[PDB]
Ligand binder design. Structure first.
Ligand SMILES: O=C(O)c1ccc(-c2ccc(C(=S)NCc3ccc(-c4ccnn4-c4ccc(Cl)c(Cl)c4)cc3)c(Cl)c2)o1
Length: 123
């Protein structure tokens, strides 16, 4: 409804990246999804997600969630609640968020636009 950005967990991206808050179950919007160059493994999907305030491109789907993308329930513009995730840190210091369980609250067709004007999270 009205006040669309009120549907999203504003501040969750900063909470995840800094505090390392993991007990939260934030509601985020999918902005973009794309497959990763994998080789001969099942595909991996990388997601650009928004909390209304920030976007962050360092999300990856657990392979068990691949059917959500492949059967088109999880697509750009949909709004999801993250129920389980972990943060990992690469050798170079970059952090990545692995989404393990999520729920689609509103399909892409029911939302239809990028909500608000989120800006890229820095670090
Ligand atoms: O069920 C499962 O699939 C499951 C359970 C636990 C895990 C799981 C555990 C650890 C990892 C990690 S950080 N692998 C490191 C990894 C690092 C880079 C990559 C990777 C390959 C191409 N791009 N790219 C990349 C680079 C930068 C960022 Cl910010 C992102 Cl989001 C992706 C691919 C993998 C990943 Cl990807 C998944 O997966």
């Amino acid at each position: 409804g009205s006040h669309m950005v009120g549907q999203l967990s504003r501040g969750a991206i900063a909470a995840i990246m800094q505090k390392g808050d993991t007990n939260i179950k934030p509601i985020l919007q999918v902005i973009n999804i794309r497959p990763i160059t994998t080789g001969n493994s099942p595909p991996r999907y990388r997601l650009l997600m928004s909390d209304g305030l920030n976007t962050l491109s360092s999300f990856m789907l657990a392979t068990q969630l691949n059917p959500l993308v492949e059967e088109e329930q999880l697509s750009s513009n949909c709004v999801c609640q993250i129920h389980r995730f972990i943060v990992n840190t690469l050798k170079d210091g970059r952090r990545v968020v692995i989404l393990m369980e999520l729920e689609v609250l509103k399909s892409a067709e029911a939302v239809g636009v990028k909500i608000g004007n989120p800006v890229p999270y820095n670090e």
